[PDB]
A paper describes a structure:
To confirm if a monovalent metal ion binds in the pre-reaction state, we soaked the I-PpoI crystals in buffer containing Tl+ and detected anomalous electron density at the metal ion-binding site without product formation. (B) Tl+ anomalous signal was detected at the I-PpoI metal ion-binding site after 1800s soaking in 70 mM Tl+. The anomalous map for Tl+ was determined with X-ray at a wavelength of 0.9765 Å and contoured at 3.0 σ. In addition, only one Tl+ was detected by its anomalous signal in the pre-reaction state. Our results support that the monovalent metal ion can bind within the active site without initiating reaction, in corroboration with our biochemical assays. The biochemical and structural results indicate that additional monovalent metal ion may not be necessary for DNA hydrolysis. However, crystal deterioration limited us from soaking the I-PpoI crystals in high concentration of Tl+ for in crystallo reaction.
Author numbering:
A (entry chain A): 2 to 163
B (entry chain B): 202 to 363
The structure:
DNA sequence: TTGACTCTCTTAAGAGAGTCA
DNA sequence: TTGACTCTCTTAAGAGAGTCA
């Protein structure tokens, strides 16, 4: 098992490497009709990605470090949270992009929460539109809005009441 | 099946059978500290479920009818929408429970929308809490709230900015 | 020890189709 | 014809692990 010092060193080498990713400025909706700016540190689209990083899926990467001849590997966005509890309320903790930008590995753009909380940020009105998340959103969710419903509630007869 | 008249006959037969399901009253949060009341028509927990209905999964059912001697089968919640486009913006249309009650088959609790719109209703603040869905929600989403984030955005060094 | 690939799995909102009687 | 079971698949937010040099 890695000591807490070894984990800290893993987190430090991860931050060192990610800090050299290309930094892209994105203008984003905050809610309430406001505009804000996020700076994402984006993993490259193709190899090489950076020391310790490899792509295991179209938008999935892993970080790998070998310590005392033992290979350790983590999901690439989970590394900032290696000193945190890994579950809550019986649910696994997941890396959650506050910037909604999968390639971004900026730890200031990530939080550590259940998959349901993670997903729900897709529909949040944003920090200036009424977000109620205790760890506040950085932007309005990309899927927030009136939606595109094709057909609403309806019946042909009179068998039903709401 | 194929013709419009045949499709109307399927919707009417479905409504007649579901109109005989047990009607269960559920009191629900509306948002804004308000409460409302919904009447769900709930498919039975075990066989028999009703004429034409069979369970294909723990919370999945199908409706089956024999038309021109050929069996036609649909997901049990899709029948009200058989005359609607089955996609929108290149996304499949799905039956979306406004009451968030899978066993309910009340078509006044169903709409027809992309899977993303469907999912997002889980986190909607509700019709009295700021819902912006064009086809309005019937209740606050069961997952709306501050969340239970274990760790927020953080860095150990000074390589990152928001 | 390291890079660049390969594969399958989880979750919770949803689906389609076959085997018997 | 109808009922009651079986099985796997889709999506988009997320994961773990093997092989080879
Ligand atoms: Tl997310
Ligand atoms: Tl739903
Ligand atoms: Zn970012
Ligand atoms: Zn939020
Ligand atoms: Zn209902
Ligand atoms: Zn809504």
């Amino acid at each position: 098992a890695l000591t807490n010092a070894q984990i800290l060193a893993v987190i430090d080498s991860w931050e060192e490497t990610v800090g050299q990713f290309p930094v892209i400025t994105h203008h984003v909706p905050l809610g309430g009709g406001l505009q804000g700016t996020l700076h994402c540190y984006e993993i490259p689209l193709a190899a090489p990605y950076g020391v310790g990083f490899a792509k295991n899926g179209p938008t999935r990467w892993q970080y790998k470090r070998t310590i005392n001849q033992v290979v350790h590997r983590w999901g690439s966005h989970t590394v900032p949270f290696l000193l945190e509890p890994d579950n809550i309320n019986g649910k696994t903790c997941t890396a959650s992009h506050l910037c909604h930008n999968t390639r971004c590995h900026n730890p200031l753009h990530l939080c550590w929460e259940s998959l349901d909380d993670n997903k729900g940020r897709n529909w949040c009105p944003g920090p200036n539109g009424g977000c109620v998340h205790a760890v506040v959103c950085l932007r309005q969710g990309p899927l927030y809005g009136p939606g595109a419903t094709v057909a609403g509630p309806q019946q042909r007869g009179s068998h039903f009441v709401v």
